[PDB]
Symmetry: C2
């Protein structure tokens, strides 16, 4: 916990930055099709999210192992589900970076419109991806410092509106569009949840990165809960404020409602600032998620549950080869941005890989109960209550997702089972083996 370890502040900002990412600037537009009643959804979401964060906070307290969810799963269920957890989470991590870099450079197209030409966009995206791979190769202190700065920058317009927009906030504007979904109350709330439940992916960030965090038993829980709280407060305040500052129709039509509304309100410099800050958030988030990919792959390979090259490190302990591999894969999938059709072809892959993350969450909740029951004391009813909420959080997220995406997630589980069996027979140790031949 000295030289190559990351301090509390950069880790906390990595959690909140990984969570807020691209999404925070786009949330009001997505929620505007439902209306102000979305506040109820937020209320439901945050209680769930906090629950999940607490689950991680306690689990990482009990076991600050590198790789987080993976390790926990491995502890309570064994090598097969550890293997599965890592495959799913690793894939989610680097596949999710494509959309993020596309959105991020997209924000930068405010200054340089050539970035909307799909070819230049693709080249630029590949270059930026490799920039953050290289920053990750320099080391975790470097990447978390870069993301810390990026996250503060991204927080500038969010906190700005979330504090000072209230002078322009009109309750009549907010309530004029309380429910424009056409649905009853539960339906409207559900259509809200279909957006907001996915807003807290990244809660697991500090847990997974526990191996490079200074004093992780103390700092990982703090960073987890703190990052989630920062995200929640920003989410609510900013979306509510904007819903009270801008008429619902305009909010619905806008593709960048902080930026379009900023550019119109305080001038073009405002739009430039919001665009720059949004781009900063996205690009820093790239660094964070790449770090997480490297870490999970490294822990799994360290246990012989992922190819050994993912555990090959330099003198600093950085998984350089694994990061380069992730770079190559991301580069290959990034080619989808060369055309609208190519982009939409890739879209269902992204949507599926986002669902991948929920299995690590589920196993983390289960791991908390199965591994840590002897640490609960007479606060056991509370733990059960919180973890159950966290369980519900995950399940509901899937319940509201598109059927096709979940179908292909299921297929992915099956393929992973087949892969484990075909690659690890003779190596795998059985809980209840057959007698000797």
């Amino acid at each position: 916990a000295d030289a190559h370890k990351v301090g509390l502040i950069p880790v906390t900002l990595m959690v909140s930055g990984n969570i807020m990412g691209s999404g925070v600037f786009l949330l009001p537009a997505n929620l505007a099709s439902t209306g102000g009643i979305a506040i109820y959804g937020w209320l439901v979401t945050i209680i769930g999210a906090l629950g999940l964060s607490m689950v991680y906070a306690k689990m990482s307290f009990l076991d600050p192992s590198p790789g987080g969810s993976y390790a926990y799963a491995r502890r309570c269920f064994g090598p097969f589900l550890g293997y599965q957890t890592n495959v799913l989470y690793w894939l989610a991590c680097w596949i999710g970076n494509i959309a993020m870099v596309v959105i991020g450079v997209g924000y930068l197209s405010y200054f340089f419109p050539i970035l909307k030409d799909p070819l230049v966009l693709t080249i630029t995206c590949v270059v930026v991806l490799w920039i953050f791979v290289l920053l990750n190769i320099v080391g975790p202190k470097m990447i978390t410092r870069v993301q810390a700065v990026a996250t503060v920058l991204a927080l500038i317009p969010i906190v700005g509106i979330a504090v000072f927009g209230w002078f322009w906030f009109r309750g009549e504007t907010y309530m004029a569009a309380w429910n424009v979904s056409g649905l009853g109350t539960f339906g409207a709330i559900q259509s809200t949840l279909n957006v907001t439940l996915w807003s807290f992916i990244g809660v697991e960030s500090a847990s997974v990165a526990a191996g490079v965090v200074k004093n992780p038993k103390r700092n990982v829980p703090i960073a987890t809960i703190g990052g989630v709280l920062i995200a929640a407060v920003c989410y609510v305040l900013s979306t509510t404020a904007i819903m009270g500052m801008i008429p619902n129709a305009a909010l619905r039509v806008s593709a960048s409602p902080f930026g379009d509304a900023a550019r119109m309100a305080l001038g073009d410099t405002a739009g430039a600032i919001v665009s720059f800050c949004a781009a900063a958030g996205c690009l820093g988030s790239l660094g964070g998620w790449t770090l997480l990919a490297g870490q999970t792959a490294k822990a799994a390979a360290d246990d012989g549950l992922f190819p050994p090259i993912f555990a090959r490190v330099n003198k600093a302990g950085t998984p350089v080869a694994g990061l380069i591999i992730v770079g190559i894969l991301m580069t290959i999938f990034q080619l989808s941005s060369i055309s609208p059709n190519a982009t939409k072809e890739f879209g269902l892959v992204s949507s599926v890989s986002v669902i991948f993350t929920l299995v690590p969450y589920l196993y983390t909740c289960a791991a908390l109960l199965l591994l840590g029951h002897g640490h609960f004391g007479k606060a056991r009813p509370a733990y059960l209550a919180v973890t159950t909420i966290a369980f519900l959080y995950c399940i509901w997220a899937v319940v509201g997702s598109g059927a096709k995406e979940v179908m292909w997630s299921f297929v992915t589980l099956m393929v992973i089972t087949a892969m484990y069996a075909l690659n690890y027979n003779r190596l795998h140790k059985n809980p209840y083996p057959l007698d000797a031949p």
Copy 2:
């Protein structure tokens, strides 16, 4: 103990009877929207299905444990996946019985058309379900003897056509409808697989019933492979024969095309004989699937991985309380046949519970490799190849299913994980526990 065990012939007819079931008399009508090219789909399916049956034969040879797949999954993956396997398979067993009894009683409405009134149909179904529950309480020797007779009766119109229909078979008829799907060759085959891959559910029957089979190390592998071969040969010969005897247009439209083709070819008694035999097939299958439900639940409860009541037995070792609980559950869901709308609602459930079975298949495949590698010798490549083909059968079945049904299957996995964790924490043994509190 040997006195309440079932011999080779009845177990083999239980496998082939559980496989053929309701399906066999409806296949030609289902395949007629594709056409004669379905033979290509049969060839692919039968290679996959034989592969899966070889896997079950070899695994049960190495470990003829009660509960089949449940036991193998617990061995190679531990209590959690054992628990999951049983819940899934148990549910699939008794939930699937609802559609089967409706179809079976449906056939009997050829004689008694009052059975087509939804109210009389539901009462009758409830009564018939309790009959086969009560026969199971008499014992496995009684239920497999009843099913053996029923299966042989059900085979009379099937084998009759598959041997003697060829006198009326015409290639011009068959080839006039070679491909009426409107799709290309791969697509036509795929539309065939969407039907035929689900035609071999029940391959696991002898394996799951190993605890009531005489000399199971010998007889389960024979009955498993033997039963599948009987189904495969019957499926192919009879669907092919009918597609060459009856014009595609008429075949596409028939609700009972062995019955419609028979009743009009050799007279009204012919339609009576086919109706009675098809009803026998369905009802016998009710008995066997109910037996399997009792066996899997008992095997899990014996290991403390299902409620204790499911392991309470009479002097003969029959899980009487377990059978009664399944009777009650079946009765509650059987209420869905009182109305068309009531039946449509229940339909998704049946559709979902059918996918459940493939997870046990998948774990059985993994278990063979994981547990049994040391028994392969240098015949190892053959085992890897066959098991890989069995893996592909399972994945392919799912890839071709409706998205919504697979989604709710995924959700069910999540709920089960949450249930395991909330029910078995403090009892569950962790592979890598934390240190002492």
